[PDB]
């Protein structure tokens with residue numbers, strides 16, 4: 068094992084809609100577990116007690132390197148939650164860098180709507196910053212430990228691929244140039260808590276929504292591999308849905324389809340992709356008055372579920388914009404913590420369309436970009 072980037076290519080798996088996971092080991096001797104990759108939280112936590120949905124769990128008693136921190140912890144996500152006991156142990160990523168680190172681990176003893184029946188993961192790796200860690204920001208997140216204890220550079224990249232089985236790559240400590248095409252375009256990380264960014268403009272089929280750009284970032288915009296959907300603030304959501312409805316009005320949809328509560332189905336291979344618009348999100352750039360855009364295909368926001376059946380993967384939010392897994396899919400996303408920026412490029416595993424392509428394009432000029440941030 069060398070820790071070379073090729074060794075990390077294709078190291079992610081998942082079941083559709085159930086999250087992307089990476090293989091990790093905890094303890095001595097090493098206990099193998101599959102771990103959800105979550106850029107939207109900052110705690111490393113594993114099942115540590117039997118649960119109807121867990122096929123295996125962390126057995127602290129069998130680890131000679133386990134150290135109790137004698138402190139309890141709970142984490143409330145949007146719907147799911149867990150509580151457990153804090154400890155430290157030795158952690159490796161088999162298809163990752165050739166290193167072992169001692170990291171904080173929350174041993175989950177009780178949970179509510181957290182684990183998923185048949186997901187094949189037993190834990191969560193929160194890759195965001197200490198500021199949002201529980202119980203508080205003194206609990207050092209895994210990636211901070213990794214960088215502090217080793218020579219692994221302070222960055223990682225994610226290539227989330229489509230299809231049902233899903234796959235992808237987490238390149239730890241760098242950028243693998245075989246995984247994307249064209250140029251990487253970078254947006255600043257506004258604040259190190261969530262991976263917070265600033266959207267400066269939104270277009271749907273080349274037509275500007277013409278909203279006050281503050282609305283796009285009310286009350287924040289984040290990049291979150293642990294959230295499935297594109298989530299949009301109420302006002303933006305309504306404008307977007309009105310526009311997508313009108314673009315696709317030649318077709319008949321249930322009312323609860325647009326709410327994400329119903330499926331729409333078409334005769335296998337007759338999905339009318341052309342009637343659903345592309346969405347362009349413009350992100351603040353690296354230089355003065357400069358931005359770039361990422362363009363989202365309808366194949367990203369109509370999520371296939373088991374004729375071809377789809378859920379609407381844009382949902383209303385009262386907690387800000389979330390660029391979830393459906394947005395990240397078909398892009399190569401670089402979380403360059405070292406230079407406080409997030410990079411985007413067209414992925415090698417790009418989502419196909421007959422006549423359109425997901426794109427990352429620039430430079431664009433955009434005045435008063437700082438006004439777009441919510442305060």
Ligand SMILES: CO[C@H](C)C(=O)N[C@@H](Cc1cccc(-c2nccs2)c1)[C@H](O)CN[C@H]1CC2(CCC2)Oc2ncc(CC(C)(C)C)cc21
Nearest residue numbers: 084085086105107108142143144145146147199293294386
């Ligand atoms: C299900 O997705 C919902 C939106 C979700 O809560 N996902 C989790 C991670 C997680 C946890 C459990 C299961 C999953 C998945 N299920 C299916 C696929 S992934 C994912 C993800 O961490 C959410 N990130 C933000 C997403 C937001 C919305 C804006 C911030 O809400 C959150 N609220 C609380 C937390 C936990 C904190 C950091 C406060 C301790 C985080 C977040």
